[PDB]
Amino acid sequence: IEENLRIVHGLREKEKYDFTVLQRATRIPFQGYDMDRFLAQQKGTPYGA
């Protein structure tokens, strides 16, 4: 009932619209040269991380 109440109020729609408004500054992340190596140093999995 409650999540449909925020629907009939339109609060989920405000949530979604705020999503794309916030999207107006988020730079594209740099994903590293060897994107698997990027994520690997990210999770710390290669030797020494």
Partner: peptide, 20 residues
């Protein structure tokens, strides 16, 4: 030849430009 395309262009929902 986009790298890690099978997770980025194919399976990353927002095409890798959108941060969820």
């Amino acid at each position: 030849q986009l790298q890690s395309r099978e997770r980025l262009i194919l399976g990353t929902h927002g095409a890798g430009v959108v941060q969820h």
